[PDB]
Ligand binder design. Structure first.
Ligand SMILES: CS(=O)(=O)Nc1ncn(-c2cc(F)c(COc3ccc(OS(=O)(=O)O)cc3)c(F)c2)n1
Ligand SMILES: OC[C@H]1O[C@@](CO)(O[C@H]2O[C@H](CO)[C@@H](O)[C@H](O)[C@H]2O)[C@@H](O)[C@@H]1O
Ligand SMILES: OC[C@H]1O[C@@](CO)(O[C@H]2O[C@H](CO)[C@@H](O)[C@H](O)[C@H]2O)[C@@H](O)[C@@H]1O
Length: 467
């Protein structure tokens, strides 16, 4: 039997709910969908809806009742969604749709995307103090999954991740960043699944643990053992590092090919992550890291050091591997239920129903060796994928994805973020789900609105005109 929500987490929740209740209520973001077989007809429906919402009767109906009525039409091949806070934004967005013009709150396509979405599970550098807290208090599905992971992590490591999420005075270190982002990744994807969505394939960059869960390669319990074992070993190892044993990590604007020649001058550098066509994260002794940084800056290339005294995906991980091996005994790798672009295995693809991959050796190899991220993405583009959806508290890896997709010739990919610092977390997920609908991916747009309890919940337009 699993541990429950701790007493301190309940105390922090009550206080956060009082802070929330005393705050300035903000208008929700509402998705208004129009569609038709022909784009020209879709454009006319948008202009007709805009005319009606400008009338006194349309002005008197809530955005939510308008969007609920729209959610019940036939959903045609040519689709658009206007995301709006008030009637003025809605009408303006609908004029854009009718005019075939672009606007920040408007998505409009002539037809569905041909291949299903790639879920991107990264996470490095995405953390911030209050990540996940707002959505936890305001979304019961997300909350339920956060609490489920909070219980497994309590059982594995002996502390509550929910306490960290709810206590604004606490911040994240190397260990707690990984397990908390994992919990947020699990809960974000299950929230999406609750509304009908699903990955055609996953790709990881920790995020590998959560990718294994959503690919059906491990149970939630064994994915949690994977992230817990790696996280606490890395945090405890990094904390004992001083002096000649410190190893830095840095981003440099070199491609894999340039790195090969550049490294001939720096015998102890290794590649941590091939992140984008000309962005590589390297690691090694501080004197050599500073020198490659100075070389890149002298060549007009950007370079940036990260905050860590240890370098994962380098030989410095060798002391941890034996203990990682011991802690992961008992996990049960299963056959994947969607595709996997494995950045541990050089970016290659594993098909749904393939042989399992997520055994103990996988997690050792992943922790010790380079992450072939840009290779996995390029493999996804080359096999027809155009929609990439990142589950994260901040869309860091989507910026890397955009660089690879453009470089592989795909200049209009669908790059869908989820949460973002200083963006309303509930509004962000409305947007994520509206985009999945517009491009034709699995999503039940009716579940974006509560069930109607009376006629005031509908608007006097098709298909719910009042008789
Ligand atoms: C104003 S600017 O343009 O100069 N700043 C700027 N530009 C691009 N940036 C950037 C590029 C990146 F590829 C990454 C990802 O970096 C990782 C580092 C370790 C890592 O390790 S792992 O997850 O364990 O595999 C995984 C990923 C990043 F976080 C930032 N930053
Ligand atoms: O929530 C803001 C407000 O609550 C107080 C107690 O009234 O502190 C609570 O919330 C803090 C922020 O998460 C926690 O760190 C603290 O433990 C909790 O009691 C106030 O001090 C704070 O201003
Ligand atoms: O065209 C069907 C296709 O569209 C999606 C959203 O992309 O679902 C929409 O259409 C369904 C009716 O065909 C509705 O049930 C649903 O509410 C609406 O979102 C996909 O899920 C579906 O495959």
């Amino acid at each position: 039997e699993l541990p429950g929500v701790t007493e301190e987490a309940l105390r922090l929740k009550e206080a956060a709910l009082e802070e929330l209740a005393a705050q300035e209520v903000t208008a929700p973001l509402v998705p208004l969908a129009v569609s038709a077989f022909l784009t020209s007809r879709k454009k006319a429906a948008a202009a007709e809806l805009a005319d009606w919402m400008q009338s006194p009767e349309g002005q008197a109906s809530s955005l939510e009742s308008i969007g609920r009525s729209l959610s019940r039409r036939n959903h045609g091949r040519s689709r658009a969604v206007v995301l709006a806070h008030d009637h003025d934004e809605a009408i303006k967005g609908l004029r854009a749709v009718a005019a075939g013009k672009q606007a920040p709150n408007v998505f409009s396509v002539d037809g569905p995307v041909t291949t299903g979405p790639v879920w991107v599970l990264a996470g490095f550098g995405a953390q911030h103090r209050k990540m996940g807290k707002s959505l936890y208090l305001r979304n019961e599905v997300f909350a339920a999954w956060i609490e489920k992971v909070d219980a497994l992590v309590q059982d594995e490591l002996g502390y509550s991740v929910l306490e960290l999420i709810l206590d604004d005075a606490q911040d994240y270190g190397i260990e707690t960043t990984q397990v908390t982002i994992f919990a947020i990744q699990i809960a974000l994807g299950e929230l999406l699944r609750h509304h009908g969505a699903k990955p055609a394939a996953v790709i990881g960059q920790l995020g590998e643990a959560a990718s294994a869960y959503f690919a059906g390669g491990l149970s939630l319990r064994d994915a949690t053992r994977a992230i817990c074992s790696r996280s606490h070993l890395m945090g405890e190892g990094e904390a004992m590092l001083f002096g000649e044993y410190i190893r830095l990590m840095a981003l440099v604007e070199y491609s894999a090919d340039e790195i090969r020649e550049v490294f001939s001058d720096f015998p102890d550098l290794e590649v941590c992550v091939y992140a984008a066509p000309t962005q590589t994260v390297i690691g090694g002794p501080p004197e050599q890291v500073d020198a490659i940084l100075a070389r890149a800056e002298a060549e007009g290339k950007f370079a940036r050091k990260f905050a860590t005294k240890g370098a994962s995906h380098t030989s410095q991980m060798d002391p941890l591997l034996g203990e990682l091996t011991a802690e992961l005994q008992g996990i049960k790798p299963t056959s994947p239920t969607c595709g996997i672009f494995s950045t541990v295995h050089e970016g290659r693809y594993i098909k749904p129903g393939g042989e399992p991959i997520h055994d103990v050796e996988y997690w050792k190899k992943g922790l010790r060796h380079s992450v072939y991220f840009t290779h996995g993405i390029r493999n996804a583009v080359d096999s027809g994928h155009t929609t990439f959806l990142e589950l994260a508290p901040n869309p860091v890896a989507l910026m890397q994805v955009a660089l690879t997709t453009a470089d592989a010739g795909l200049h209009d990919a669908q790059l869908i973020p989820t949460l973002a610092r200083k963006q309303d977390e509930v509004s962000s997920m409305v947007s994520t789900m509206a985009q999945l609908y517009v491009y034709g991916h699995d999503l039940d747009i009716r579940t974006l609105f509560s069930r109607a309890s009376g006629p005031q919940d509908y608007a006097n337009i098709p298909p719910t005109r009042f008789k």
